[PDB]
Design an enzyme around this catalytic site. Structure first.
Site, PDB file in Angstrom:
ATOM      1  N   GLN A  54       0.803  -1.215   0.000  1.00 55.21           N
ATOM      2  CA  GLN A  54       0.000   0.000   0.000  1.00 55.21           C
ATOM      3  C   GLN A  54       0.841   1.273   0.000  1.00 55.21           C
ATOM      4  OE1 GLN A  54      -4.070   1.742   1.945  1.00 55.21           O
ATOM      5  NE2 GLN A  54      -3.018   0.064   2.994  1.00 55.21           N
ATOM      6  N   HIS A  95       1.434   3.689  -3.353  1.00 56.44           N
ATOM      7  CA  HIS A  95       0.795   5.001  -3.360  1.00 56.44           C
ATOM      8  C   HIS A  95       1.642   6.167  -3.826  1.00 56.44           C
ATOM      9  CE1 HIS A  95      -2.972   3.652  -1.694  1.00 56.44           C
ATOM     10  NE2 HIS A  95      -3.404   4.897  -1.631  1.00 56.44           N
ATOM     11  N   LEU A 146      -5.566  -3.277 -11.549  1.00 55.39           N
ATOM     12  CA  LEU A 146      -4.943  -4.547 -11.183  1.00 55.39           C
ATOM     13  C   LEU A 146      -4.350  -4.618  -9.784  1.00 55.39           C
ATOM     14  CD1 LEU A 146      -1.962  -5.859 -13.348  1.00 55.39           C
ATOM     15  CD2 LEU A 146      -1.936  -5.816 -10.869  1.00 55.39           C
ATOM     16  N   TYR A 147      -3.732  -3.529  -9.362  1.00 56.49           N
ATOM     17  CA  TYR A 147      -3.080  -3.489  -8.070  1.00 56.49           C
ATOM     18  C   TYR A 147      -4.012  -3.450  -6.877  1.00 56.49           C
ATOM     19  CZ  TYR A 147       1.791  -3.303  -6.520  1.00 56.49           C
ATOM     20  OH  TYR A 147       3.021  -3.555  -5.970  1.00 56.49           O
ATOM     21  N   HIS A 165      -6.947  -5.166  -2.165  1.00 56.74           N
ATOM     22  CA  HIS A 165      -7.555  -4.917  -0.868  1.00 56.74           C
ATOM     23  C   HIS A 165      -7.794  -6.178  -0.045  1.00 56.74           C
ATOM     24  CE1 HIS A 165      -7.962  -0.956  -2.652  1.00 56.74           C
ATOM     25  NE2 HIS A 165      -8.036  -0.474  -1.419  1.00 56.74           N
ATOM     26  N   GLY A 197       0.617  -8.169 -14.448  1.00 59.49           N
ATOM     27  CA  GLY A 197       1.322  -7.331 -13.488  1.00 59.49           C
ATOM     28  C   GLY A 197       2.804  -7.075 -13.710  1.00 59.49           C
ATOM     29  N   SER A 248       4.863  -3.889 -13.818  1.00 61.24           N
ATOM     30  CA  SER A 248       5.715  -3.883 -12.662  1.00 61.24           C
ATOM     31  C   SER A 248       7.184  -3.664 -12.993  1.00 61.24           C
ATOM     32  CB  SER A 248       5.531  -5.185 -11.895  1.00 61.24           C
ATOM     33  OG  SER A 248       6.218  -5.125 -10.668  1.00 61.24           O
TER      34      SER A 248
HETATM   35  C1  COH Z   1      -2.793  -2.897  -2.840  1.00 62.66           C
HETATM   36  C2  COH Z   1      -2.866  -1.586  -2.250  1.00 62.66           C
HETATM   37  C3  COH Z   1      -3.905  -1.092  -1.385  1.00 62.66           C
HETATM   38  C4  COH Z   1      -4.239  -1.428  -0.075  1.00 62.66           C
HETATM   39  C5  COH Z   1      -3.571  -2.505   0.851  1.00 62.66           C
HETATM   40  C6  COH Z   1      -5.389  -0.587   0.268  1.00 62.66           C
HETATM   41  C7  COH Z   1      -6.022  -0.612   1.503  1.00 62.66           C
HETATM   42  C8  COH Z   1      -7.109   0.134   1.935  1.00 62.66           C
HETATM   43  C9  COH Z   1      -7.725   0.048   3.288  1.00 62.66           C
HETATM   44  C10 COH Z   1      -7.306  -0.836   4.404  1.00 62.66           C
HETATM   45  C11 COH Z   1      -6.874  -0.409   5.651  1.00 62.66           C
HETATM   46  C12 COH Z   1      -8.753   0.942   3.298  1.00 62.66           C
HETATM   47  C13 COH Z   1      -9.709   1.258   4.420  1.00 62.66           C
HETATM   48  C14 COH Z   1      -8.746   1.556   1.950  1.00 62.66           C
HETATM   49  C15 COH Z   1      -9.620   2.509   1.559  1.00 62.66           C
HETATM   50  C16 COH Z   1      -9.668   3.110   0.360  1.00 62.66           C
HETATM   51  N1  COH Z   1      -8.807   2.832  -0.664  1.00 62.66           N
HETATM   52 CO1  COH Z   1      -7.284   1.529  -0.760  1.00 62.66          CO
HETATM   53  N2  COH Z   1      -5.736   0.221  -0.803  1.00 62.66           N
HETATM   54  C17 COH Z   1      -4.843  -0.095  -1.763  1.00 62.66           C
HETATM   55  C18 COH Z   1      -4.848   0.512  -3.004  1.00 62.66           C
HETATM   56  C19 COH Z   1      -5.774   1.511  -3.414  1.00 62.66           C
HETATM   57  C20 COH Z   1      -5.784   2.192  -4.810  1.00 62.66           C
HETATM   58  C21 COH Z   1      -4.768   1.841  -5.902  1.00 62.66           C
HETATM   59  C22 COH Z   1      -6.840   3.059  -4.750  1.00 62.66           C
HETATM   60  C23 COH Z   1      -7.431   3.939  -5.904  1.00 62.66           C
HETATM   61  C24 COH Z   1      -7.014   5.427  -5.955  1.00 62.66           C
HETATM   62  C25 COH Z   1      -5.534   5.712  -5.865  1.00 62.66           C
HETATM   63  O1  COH Z   1      -4.996   5.896  -4.730  1.00 62.66           O
HETATM   64  O2  COH Z   1      -4.909   5.759  -6.938  1.00 62.66           O
HETATM   65  C26 COH Z   1      -7.439   2.958  -3.426  1.00 62.66           C
HETATM   66  C27 COH Z   1      -8.542   3.709  -2.992  1.00 62.66           C
HETATM   67  C28 COH Z   1      -9.214   3.702  -1.737  1.00 62.66           C
HETATM   68  C29 COH Z   1     -10.417   4.588  -1.304  1.00 62.66           C
HETATM   69  C30 COH Z   1     -11.237   5.745  -2.086  1.00 62.66           C
HETATM   70  C31 COH Z   1     -12.469   5.304  -2.925  1.00 62.66           C
HETATM   71  C32 COH Z   1     -12.143   4.350  -4.096  1.00 62.66           C
HETATM   72  O3  COH Z   1     -11.342   4.750  -5.006  1.00 62.66           O
HETATM   73  O4  COH Z   1     -12.706   3.219  -4.145  1.00 62.66           O
HETATM   74  C33 COH Z   1     -10.718   4.203   0.052  1.00 62.66           C
HETATM   75  C34 COH Z   1     -11.804   4.736   1.004  1.00 62.66           C
HETATM   76  N3  COH Z   1      -6.756   1.971  -2.601  1.00 62.66           N
HETATM   77  N4  COH Z   1      -7.740   1.075   1.097  1.00 62.66           N
HETATM   78  C1  LIG Z   2       6.765   0.486 -10.503  1.00 59.88           C
HETATM   79  C2  LIG Z   2       6.541  -0.644  -9.517  1.00 59.88           C
HETATM   80  C3  LIG Z   2       5.276  -1.444  -9.854  1.00 59.88           C
HETATM   81  C4  LIG Z   2       5.057  -2.691  -9.323  1.00 59.88           C
HETATM   82  C5  LIG Z   2       6.033  -3.284  -8.424  1.00 59.88           C
HETATM   83  C6  LIG Z   2       5.543  -4.106  -7.288  1.00 59.88           C
HETATM   84  C7  LIG Z   2       4.726  -5.195  -7.495  1.00 59.88           C
HETATM   85  C8  LIG Z   2       4.280  -5.593  -8.862  1.00 59.88           C
HETATM   86  C9  LIG Z   2       2.840  -5.669  -9.132  1.00 59.88           C
HETATM   87  C10 LIG Z   2       2.333  -6.676  -9.903  1.00 59.88           C
HETATM   88  C11 LIG Z   2       3.257  -7.738 -10.506  1.00 59.88           C
HETATM   89  C12 LIG Z   2       2.635  -9.038 -11.007  1.00 59.88           C
HETATM   90  C13 LIG Z   2       3.087 -10.237 -10.550  1.00 59.88           C
HETATM   91  C14 LIG Z   2       4.193 -10.294  -9.563  1.00 59.88           C
HETATM   92  C15 LIG Z   2       4.761 -11.627  -9.230  1.00 59.88           C
HETATM   93  C16 LIG Z   2       5.735 -12.189 -10.018  1.00 59.88           C
HETATM   94  C17 LIG Z   2       6.225 -11.485 -11.187  1.00 59.88           C
HETATM   95  C18 LIG Z   2       7.559 -10.783 -11.131  1.00 59.88           C
HETATM   96  C19 LIG Z   2       8.642 -11.608 -11.780  1.00 59.88           C
HETATM   97  C20 LIG Z   2       8.323 -11.900 -13.238  1.00 59.88           C
HETATM   98  O1  LIG Z   2       7.449 -12.768 -13.488  1.00 59.88           O
HETATM   99  O2  LIG Z   2       8.942 -11.259 -14.124  1.00 59.88           O
END
Ligand code: COH
Ligand SMILES: CC/C=C\C/C=C\C/C=C\C/C=C\C/C=C\CCCC(=O)O
Ligand SMILES: *[C@@H]1O[C@H](CO)[C@@H](O[C@@H]2O[C@H](CO)[C@@H](O[C@@H]3O[C@H](CO[C@@H]4O[C@H](CO)[C@@H](O)[C@H](O[C@H]5O[C@H](CO)[C@@H](O)[C@H](O)[C@@H]5O)[C@@H]4O)[C@@H](O)[C@H](O)[C@@H]3O)[C@H](O)[C@H]2NC(C)=O)[C@H](O)[C@H]1NC(C)=O
Ligand SMILES: *[C@@H]1O[C@H](CO)[C@@H](O[C@@H]2O[C@H](CO)[C@@H](O[C@@H]3O[C@H](CO[C@@H]4O[C@H](CO)[C@@H](O)[C@H](O[C@H]5O[C@H](CO)[C@@H](O)[C@H](O)[C@@H]5O)[C@@H]4O)[C@@H](O)[C@H](O)[C@@H]3O)[C@H](O)[C@H]2NC(C)=O)[C@H](O)[C@H]1NC(C)=O
Ligand code: COH
Ligand SMILES: *[C@@H]1O[C@H](CO)[C@@H](O[C@@H]2O[C@H](CO)[C@@H](O)[C@H](O)[C@H]2NC(C)=O)[C@H](O)[C@H]1NC(C)=O
Ligand SMILES: *[C@@H]1O[C@H](CO)[C@@H](O[C@@H]2O[C@H](CO)[C@@H](O)[C@H](O)[C@H]2NC(C)=O)[C@H](O)[C@H]1NC(C)=O
Ligand SMILES: *[C@@H]1O[C@H](CO)[C@@H](O[C@H]2O[C@H](CO)[C@@H](O)[C@H](O)[C@H]2NC(C)=O)[C@H](O)[C@H]1NC(C)=O
Ligand SMILES: *[C@@H]1O[C@H](CO)[C@@H](O[C@H]2O[C@H](CO)[C@@H](O)[C@H](O)[C@H]2NC(C)=O)[C@H](O)[C@H]1NC(C)=O
Ligand SMILES: CC/C=C\C/C=C\C/C=C\C/C=C\C/C=C\CCCC(=O)O
Ligand SMILES: CCCCCCCCO[C@@H]1O[C@H](CO)[C@@H](O)[C@H](O)[C@H]1O
Ligand SMILES: CCCCCCCCO[C@@H]1O[C@H](CO)[C@@H](O)[C@H](O)[C@H]1O
Ligand SMILES: CCCCCCCCO[C@@H]1O[C@H](CO)[C@@H](O)[C@H](O)[C@H]1O
Ligand SMILES: CCCCCCCCO[C@@H]1O[C@H](CO)[C@@H](O)[C@H](O)[C@H]1O
Ligand SMILES: OC[C@H]1O[C@@H](O)[C@H](O)[C@@H](O)[C@@H]1O
Ligand SMILES: OC[C@H]1O[C@@H](O)[C@H](O)[C@@H](O)[C@@H]1O
Lengths: 553, 553
Positions: A172, A176, A353-354, A357, A495, A499
């Site tokens: 996360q 971000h 894709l990322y 949650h 990804g 990535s």
């Molecule tokens: C894999 C990464 C990750 C994690 C672990 C995470 C964990 C959590 C979490 C747990 C404690 C909470 C309460 C939230 C809560 C939110 N997240 Co994220 N988020 C994550 C990646 C994102 C992304 C990417 C966005 C979309 C907007 C942006 O920041 O670009 C996001 C958007 C949001 C929004 C705004 C509305 C929406 O766009 O749907 C809320 C509220 N959230 N997130």
């Molecule tokens: C600019 C940084 C963006 C992403 C870096 C961190 C995580 C990557 C997100 C998604 C990647 C998709 C799969 C990851 C797991 C294995 C793939 C990596 C090795 C490979 O197959 O070449």
């Protein structure tokens, strides 16, 4: 007359183009094929296509040769595979960047207006029969339903791969610094200019903000001691915008670089560790270069973090993630003899894709406590109360959750997923299948084939009517995971390209930059070459707890 | 203690770096050498250095084989040399970009703050003994003097290479889409973001401005008929900032894209030709793609101009300039198998170098008239009075002026040169000689050796005290030109790299972009592949006058 590009005639990355009133033409240039729709494999393509195995297969090898790998891992056979792994994977994301929410065609605008997130595939024509272009119902499944129905967690399904929350957050936090959508400009735009690993979530994403954050002395970062431990400085010294709730905007209200990093101990945590590091870096350099100004000390230290970061993400983050026996390795030199473009531009598809949650738990275990969301979300003392050491130790020990298979997103955050499916739609992302092809796979032939089971499957067919209609986000998270995996196939295949294209596309990774003088001194270069999670922490703490991207035991 | 990097110990592009209080260290990485100062040629470097001839020599071949060349020009031996010529020359300008007025070291700041012009060499330390670092007088020659003394024209020395004013302006016009210094931010910064051939001097350099300029219909550009001929639209429809003198801001006050393009018929002229072209392009595309919107028609047409431009500049502009018998050619495919970075960033040194003001004449001949500066400068009807056809014909016929040798800048504009020498100084550009090395040449050993003669020479030694002290700008313009040349050696050697790095570094030149679909239709691609000056004009005029980058006869 139906806009022919609604069928997606062009294959193998061929550009569809309206000619006259009702016709079209595919521009198969350098696609490897020829013909009206680019489906006539040039001699070599044919060879390559006839000798290349299923990615399903590779994943097999990469995850089985218990022995073969330890041997490959101990010899140059390693770098070789690494160099290979990279090149291939990366050769997919068009660069210079192609289109954006505003243009389904190359434009000087798309190229320079860094604001626009970029897309891999064009959008689904605003005048196409169906929402996704040709097949499906004139109405896509009510996202709210589609969510609770298939993405809402029921019983907590943990990640079989051993992932831990200590990893959960990092993801996360890290993710971000490039995914910052502009509520103001709307979906399809991004604040986080710089697209990539620039730590513009530490040093903020604009020059002013950085300065309001910089202690302008010894090149360090502002900060404050609480209990004797270093922590980010509060707005009452760091006069910078934040998002802390209307309560005690004074003390306990810390400024970091990433606006929303106060809303969760996790992000703030890491936010601390890094800052506490940077400054730490500075202490080191200044010793080597007393005749040094402030700006330098700062910038040089910055890079060292962009370094360390890019290393740790790969040799540890992506590692644990992958599940490979092959020992991933970061070494920019491996692409020095390739045709690589040191320049990334975040893609909206990458963003969608990322959204991992489902990584999040049910509650948040800490020693004997067990903070529920309500106690966690926006909590604002937990961090200083417990301490980094202890807190980290408490995350590196709590398992995360399977990101795929389906039905594993918590209810509190389940709303995000719904918005992603809603946002995806505003954006008009082509169907999952159209996004499988583009990424070197075969389109699924049926929801049955998609999901490992048949229950969900049937229901989904009933909803989407045709497999091809299936959406992007849902596809990924509903796809049958690999055996004992964190998530399905399509995730990695789609990804990694994005990535790794971004990890190695960083200017510091270029020949031009990748010198010891860029990090001034050999000491800098070694910090980047030897970074580790275990080191990022324990070097910036009183004591060394337990830290890793996976649970122990 | 003297800042050792004031001597410039590091050689062959080695990074000088302060270590401790009074020492330093050269970072010879990938320089081809090794050792304290990088002067121990690795085995191959040595070979290459022992087998490589003087650039003085090459210029010889390239300008003599009357026959050898026509044969080379008629076979693949051509592309070969072209590919060669390119690669080499371009492999010099660091990319990603290195430093800027604010940083004599790699920084994430320098990398992304597109505002900063970029530099090839660091600056001359603010704490160095002498102004240029080590040698010279504690005071550089009074620029005003140094100017009138050596750069002020006496008798009009025309370009022996046959260059004409029709070329003179184009240069100016063209060169102004990337060289836009911010009076506000000061020297060392640039408005013209985009750095390069983006025509942001037609379509303006900001989104608003473009829109105020766009006729938002058929993707064309706003405009107005006068005498029945098409011309740029006045501010009274094109509500955009300009620089026309406090007089008739209404009619005759045309908006173009490049703020200052009203102050000289020449710039406005070209400004017309292009616009009249773009629209012309549009007319063509729309035929091929009726189902097309506006934005497209616009963007697609834009590129076609970025194309045409990049072709004409090379196959005609740079040509005439070079004096080569080798027939320069634009074909992005020639670098497709190289390790090239499709990304430029204008350098301040490049800017300084391009100040070819001596190109300008004494007066401005037109048929029987002979407008003096006063009648020319800011004139505001000349363009519509005479007409493009006629006016072009009138420039393609008046010779330009030798850009080198010295003493050939007119008095009216002589002020610019003085500012360049004054600005150079604010910037702190290292000595000419330090800038010869960096660009693969030998440092001059004496002012005598520099200038072909001895008069100026002696005087200059008397002023600078030591050849090494000599400045950048002055050096170039005071350097002995090549025989029957427009300018000396150092100009080409230093210019081309920057030059071609920028022409081919344009994203449209990348594999990714260089397709026929990028210019939608094969018709687009051919316009770019077959552009010409003679065509840029005559296709957008009533009649075909005489047009070329050189005088006839
Ligand atoms: C894999 C990464 C990750 C994690 C672990 C995470 C964990 C959590 C979490 C747990 C404690 C909470 C309460 C939230 C809560 C939110 N997240 Co994220 N988020 C994550 C990646 C994102 C992304 C990417 C966005 C979309 C907007 C942006 O920041 O670009 C996001 C958007 C949001 C929004 C705004 C509305 C929406 O766009 O749907 C809320 C509220 N959230 N997130
Ligand atoms: C600019 C940084 C963006 C992403 C870096 C961190 C995580 C990557 C997100 C998604 C990647 C998709 C799969 C990851 C797991 C294995 C793939 C990596 C090795 C490979 O197959 O070449
Ligand atoms: C990246 O890309 C985004 C766009 O996708 C950029 O942000 C957008 O920028 C535009 C332009 O600033 C902005 O425009 C909107 O459109 C409104 C329509 O404007 C009217 O219609 C035409 C347009 O020129 C005119 O004929 C109208 O007449 C005007 O003429 C006078 C000229 O002096 C005006 O002064 C007078 O008021 C009159 O109305 C009129 O202009 C516009 O009015 C409104 O302001 C609105 O903003 C978008 O809204 C921007 N926002 C976004 C995110 O879309 C972004 O800047 C780009 N990034 C960079 C750095 O280039
Ligand atoms: C590319 O790079 C250039 C810089 O080379 C960017 O333009 C410059 O940007 C800076 C920052 O906006 C600007 O700053 C100048 O410096 C003045 C000094 O500021 C004071 O000193 C420190 C700095 O933070 C503070 O301790 C002071 O206290 C302030 O704290 C409060 C915080 O809320 C303030 O609100 C309060 O007023 C108080 O004073 C104080 O800030 C600054 O005050 C002044 O505004 C001045 O502008 C440069 O002047 C800019 N101009 C240039 C060309 O140098 C450019 O933006 C970069 N490009 C991009 C897009 O990044
Ligand atoms: C080879 C290109 C070229 C030509 C032919 C040219 C022809 C002429 C010309 C003849 C009719 C006149 C009266 C001027 C007048 C000026 N030029 Co030029 N200039 C040219 C390239 C430049 C550049 C480059 C600058 C510096 C600032 C910038 O635009 O980036 C410049 C700056 C200026 C300035 C501002 C002050 C300064 O920076 O010194 C004036 C006044 N001029 N120029
Ligand atoms: C924020 O976190 C703190 C802990 O850092 C919470 O306080 C704890 O609350 C539990 C039960 O709720 C007690 O058993 C602990 O002993 C408390 N810790 C201490 C010593 O304060 C606090 O309740 C949380 N706030 C919110 C938002 O609920
Ligand atoms: C601007 O240019 C016009 C020509 O386009 C100048 O007018 C000419 O002036 C000469 C002598 O000065 C006459 O012999 C021509 O016949 C005039 N042309 C016509 C038909 O108008 C005008 O003087 C110039 N203005 C300035 C700034 O001096
Ligand atoms: C190229 O793609 C088009 C689009 O799907 C194919 O389909 C067209 O032609 C088919 C065969 O004649 C017909 O079944 C379809 O009616 C028609 N569809 C459209 C919208 O054009 C076309 O056959 C493909 N050609 C090849 C060589 O595969
Ligand atoms: C590397 O560059 C330095 C800087 O010019 C050279 O000069 C230093 O050493 C010389 C020889 O011992 C002395 O003549 C100078 O006093 C001294 N100058 C400075 C400022 O350090 C040095 O010799 C060079 N070394 C090599 C191998 O060429
Ligand atoms: C981005 C465009 C920048 C510059 C293009 C236009 C003119 C170039 C300016 C200076 C070039 C220096 C010398 C030119 C003459 C011959 C060199 C070109 C051919 C060569 O030697 O490789
Ligand atoms: C192309 C030359 C090699 C043959 C390709 C066979 C592809 C088989 O495919 C893979 O095989 C693995 C075991 O072999 C299974 O575990 C995977 O699930 C399956 O997808
Ligand atoms: C409990 C840990 C001890 C396991 C010992 C057996 C390890 C076997 O390991 C694997 O066996 C395969 C056979 O299917 C071989 O093909 C592989 O090369 C080998 O790594
Ligand atoms: C390195 C292998 C080739 C020998 C290099 C000789 C360099 C001579 O140098 C060049 O020679 C030309 C005529 O030959 C002269 O016209 C040039 O002015 C001179 O600079
Ligand atoms: C007036 C035009 C006619 C000129 C005819 C003579 C052309 C000679 O031309 C040159 O002569 C050189 C000898 O120095 C040869 O080395 C060159 O290969 C040849 O191109
Ligand atoms: O997943 C196995 C392989 O699949 C291929 O399609 C990718 O191009 C490879 O880089 C990857 O290693
Ligand atoms: O001018 C002759 C030659 O000089 C060399 O230094 C450059 O690298 C070549 O590209 C150029 O053609």
């Amino acid at each position: 007359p139906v806009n022919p590009c609604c069928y997606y005639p062009c294959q193998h990355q061929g550009i569809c183009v309206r000619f006259g009133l009702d016709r079209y033409q595919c521009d198969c240039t350098r696609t490897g094929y020829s013909g009206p729709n680019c489906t006539i494999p040039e001699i070599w393509t044919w060879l390559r296509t006839t000798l290349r195995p299923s990615p399903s297969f590779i994943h097999f090898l990469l995850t089985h040769g218990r022995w073969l790998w330890d041997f490959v891992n101990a010899t140059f056979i390693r770098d070789t595979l690494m160099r290979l792994v990279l090149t291939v994977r990366s050769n997919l994301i068009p660069s210079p960047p192609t289109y954006n929410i505003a243009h389904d065609y190359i434009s000087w605008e798309s190229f320079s207006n860094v604001s626009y997130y970029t897309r891999i595939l064009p959008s689904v024509p605003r005048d196409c029969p169906t929402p996704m272009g040709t097949k499906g119902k004139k109405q896509l499944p009510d996202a709210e339903f589609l969510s609770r129905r298939f993405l809402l967690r029921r019983k907590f399904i943990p990640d079989p791969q051993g992932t831990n929350l200590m990893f959960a957050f990092f993801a996360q936090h890290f993710t971000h610094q490039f995914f910052k959508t502009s509520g103001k400009m709307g979906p399809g735009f991004t604040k986080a200019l710089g697209h990539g690993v620039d730590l513009g979530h530490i040093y903020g994403d604009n020059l002013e903000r950085q300065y309001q954050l910089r202690l302008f002395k010894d090149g360090k970062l502002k900060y404050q001691m609480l209990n004797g431990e270093v922590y980010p400085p509060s707005v009452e010294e760091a006069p910078v915008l934040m998002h802390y709730p209307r309560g005690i905007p004074p003390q306990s209200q810390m400024a970091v670089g990433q606006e929303v990093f106060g809303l969760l101990p996790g992000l703030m945590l890491y936010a601390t560790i890094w800052l506490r590091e940077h400054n730490r870096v500075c202490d080191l350099l200044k010793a080597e270069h007393p005749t040094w100004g402030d700006e330098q000390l700062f910038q040089t230290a910055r890079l060292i973090l962009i370094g360390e970061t890019i290393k740790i993400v790969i040799e540890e983050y992506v590692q644990q993630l992958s599940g490979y026996f092959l020992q991933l390795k970061f070494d920019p030199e491996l692409l020095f003899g390739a045709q690589f473009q040191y320049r990334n531009r975040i893609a909206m598809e990458f963003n969608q894709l990322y959204h991992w949650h489902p990584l999040m738990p049910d509650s948040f275990r800490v020693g004997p406590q067990d903070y529920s969301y309500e106690q966690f979300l926006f909590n604002t003392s937990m961090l200083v109360d417990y301490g980094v050491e202890a807190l980290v130790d408490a995350f590196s020990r709590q398992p995360a959750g399977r990101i795929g298979g389906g039905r594993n997103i918590d209810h509190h955050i389940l709303h995000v997923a719904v918005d992603v499916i809603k946002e995806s739609r505003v954006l008009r992302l082509q169907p999952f299948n159209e996004y499988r092809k583009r990424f070197g796979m075969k389109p699924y032939t049926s929801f049955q084939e998609l999901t490992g089971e048949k229950e969900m499957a049937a229901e989904l067919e009933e909803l989407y009517g045709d497999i091809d209609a299936l959406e992007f986000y849902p596809g990924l998270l509903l796809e049958k995971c690999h055996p004992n995996s964190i998530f399905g196939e399509s995730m990695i295949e789609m990804g990694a390209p994005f990535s790794l294209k971004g990890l190695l596309g960083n200017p510091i990774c270029s020949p031009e930059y990748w010198k010891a003088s860029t990090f001034g001194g050999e000491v800098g270069f070694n910090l980047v070459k030897t970074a580790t999670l275990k080191k990022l922490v324990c070097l910036n703490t009183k004591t060394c707890p337990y830290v890793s991207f996976h649970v122990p035991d």
